[model samples]
Target: MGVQVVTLAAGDEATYPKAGQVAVVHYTGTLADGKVFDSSRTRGKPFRFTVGRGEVIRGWDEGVAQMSVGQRAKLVCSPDYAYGSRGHPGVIPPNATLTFDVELLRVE
Candidate 1:
């Protein structure tokens, strides 16, 4: 019904991004079947977005908010927290659940 999180590596607990701050991250997104769908790793670039501002999925909004710079974690996003029934066309199907291995790179 919501997003789930699993930590892979710890980061600085002293500094964390707040709402309206921008977060930079490298990530790989996969389906429940373990098929890769998207990856900033492949692109050789990190992604940046504003925190808690609908710049990304609801899951990322919540999940990345909990991360600190250099943190690595896995986020499991249910449909409600992902693309929902509408889904991302040509890449994701309706009602799909997505998982992401994410590394927080920086905050601005």
Candidate 2:
């Protein structure tokens, strides 16, 4: 998977959330041209899921696992890290590079 990250925490935090922890995040999935294809904000609630549970795309599993609580970052994920050759119908194109604005809101 190809994913790049830059953490932006509003305050101090040193530890990245490890695997098997539940993480709550706010995110928007976009394309190379910055077109929004999907967003958690559109639903008015944070997306919650357990990390390393195989419940998310590979990029997220690898990327967010490197994030700390309250961390926000822009993740640039390559095709192999995203939808790859079989992109989501009507939402994304095949082999598209994705940009995700993700915030690690909580971990438990």
Best-performing candidate as measured by lDDT: 1
Every candidate's lDDT: 0.83, 0.76
Q: Where is model 1 more than 4 Å wrong at Cα?
A: 88-90
Candidate 1 Cα lDDT to native:
0.83
lDDT of 1 at 59: 88
Cα-based TM-score, every candidate = 0.86, 0.82
Residues 26-59 of candidate 2: C-alpha lDDT, one tens digit per residue = 8877776867767887888988888888778778
How many residue pairs in model 1 have overlapping backbones? 0
lDDT of 1 by residue, 1-108 (tens): 488878989987557788989999887877777788778889799988998886698888888888889888888888877775687787778887778888898999
Top candidate (TM-score): 1
Error of 2 at 39 (Å): 0.8
Task: Show how many residue pairs clash in every candidate, following the order shown.
Answer: 0, 0
